[PDB]
Ligand binder design. Structure first.
Ligand SMILES: OC[C@H]1O[C@H](OC[C@H]2O[C@@](O)(CO)[C@@H](O)[C@@H]2O)[C@H](O)[C@@H](O)[C@@H]1O
Length: 404
């Protein structure tokens, strides 16, 4: 019979690729359908370029793609409209904000699978050791704590120890970290939902100068090459006081054999001042049926299974990844395993989106501009002032004649 072929999460990041293969295999066994899993590069922008080769070819070789929250506007022509396959009641079981994100000119491109938000991981053992009772609420506090703890851990012989790790590589992940920096300084959303390119302002410039100030000081020099996993690996070995990352890192750090099991918490990322907005960049992945799949019915069935209550539950319990169904946030087993889901749910609901809605099919060009200009600040090539001016000009060229 048919072989349903799935381009799912990458095996190069955490456990999500192995887990998703196992879920697809379980669906295949449950339904008596042959399945195959197609692996991906780690970084989301590299994954998009891979999937675009299949789509440009109208290839029937992949039936189901796991797609980023930032992609619906780009990928819509390559997606089977799911709307006729779901009742309204089924659709209302997902957060409406994500269903809306996934809907482009009325086409339901994809089902919400798991959401994501940037958060602050912190070593609570080390905060206590050094006389701190809460994680930092301001970036100034984060810097002061990092400097003091670093000075002590280094003095005590840990030459690998750093204050903060984050995603500073030139790729999409830096756009996510930089939106948090800019927004949490009162610098705006880089491109506002109404289309105003707002990034050339002194608050955004400051945010980027501050991040430069970390590099080689409280963060490693090499942070300018770090993606999710490079950051995670320094953190997880016990060598960083703080890390900015997504929720998936929590389960991994609690696993048996993790050096930091039981030694950390999570909270909202800090901000420049009490009246700035909390910043957590909205991430997450959706499930798309290819417009080129020869087997739409079977592929839709698989996508509904993967998005189902019990599979999202398993994702939350085993991999600490965030459901797209509100009902899971009141499930006793989900909350017993991840009590921090309760405390941070509002942070997750208030997550700030990158400008994918307003940039539409041009988002990947806009994001490339953002990460390259930001990266040039982190490397010390440019100051924040110049970078936000240059970024404004690049985004104006890219979005010229684009209306949302
Ligand atoms: O790098 C930006 C990108 O980060 C997240 O996706 C990448 C991987 O992170 C996960 O560990 C989930 O947290 C994996 O499942 C993903 O493959 C984020 O979800 C994206 O929205 C974002 O563009």
């Amino acid at each position: 019979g048919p072989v349903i072929r799935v381009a799912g999460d990458s095996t190069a990041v955490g456990e999500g690729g192995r887990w998703m293969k196992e879920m697809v295999e379980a669906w295949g066994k449950k339904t008596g359908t042959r399945v195959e899993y197609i692996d991906s590069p780690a970084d989301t922008n590299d994954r998009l370029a891979l999937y675009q080769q299949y789509w440009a070819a109208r290839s029937p070789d992949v039936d189901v793609y796991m797609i980023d929250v930032i992609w619906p506007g780009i990928v819509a022509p390559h997606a089977l409209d799911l709307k006729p396959y779901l009742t309204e009641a089924e659709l209302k079981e997902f957060f409406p904000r994500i269903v809306q994100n996934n809907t482009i000119r009325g086409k339901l491109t994809s089902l919400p699978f798991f959401t994501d938000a940037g958060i602050l991981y912190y070593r609570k053992d080390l905060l206590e050791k050094y006389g701190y009772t809460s994680p930092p609420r301001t970036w100034n506090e984060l810097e002061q704590m990092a400097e003091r703890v670093m000075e002590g851990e280094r003095r005590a012989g840990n030459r690998d120890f750093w204050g903060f790790v984050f995603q500073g590589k030139p790729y999409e992940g830096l756009t996510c970290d930089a939106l948090e920096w800019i927004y949490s300084h009162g610098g705006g959303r880089i491109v506002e939902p109404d289309g105003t390119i707002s990034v050339n302002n002194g608050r955004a410039a400051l945010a980027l100068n501050r991040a430069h100030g970390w590099v080689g000081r409280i963060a490693p020099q090499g942070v300018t090459s770090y993606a999710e996993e490079e950051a995670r690996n320094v953190w997880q070995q016990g060598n960083s006081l703080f890390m900015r990352n997504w929720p998936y890192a929590y389960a991994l750090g609690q696993a048996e054999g993790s050096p930091i099991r039981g030694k950390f918490g999570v909270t909202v990322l800090p901000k420049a001042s009490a009246d700035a907005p909390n910043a957590a960049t909205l991430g997450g992945w959706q499930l798309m049926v290819s417009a080129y799949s020869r087997y739409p019915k079977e592929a839709v069935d698989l996508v509904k299974y993967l998005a189902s209550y019990e599979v999202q539950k398993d994702n939350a319990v085993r991999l600490s990844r965030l459901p797209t169904r509100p009902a899971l946030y009141t499930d006793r087993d989900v909350l017993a395993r991840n009590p921090w889901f309760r405390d941070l749910l509002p942070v997750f609901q208030n997550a700030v989106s990158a400008p994918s809605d307003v940039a539409g099919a041009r988002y990947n060009q806009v994001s490339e501009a953002i990460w390259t200009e930001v990266h040039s600040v982190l490397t010390g090539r440019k100051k924040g002032e110049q970078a936000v001016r240059d970024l404004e000009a690049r985004i104006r060229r890219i979005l010229r004649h684009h209306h949302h």
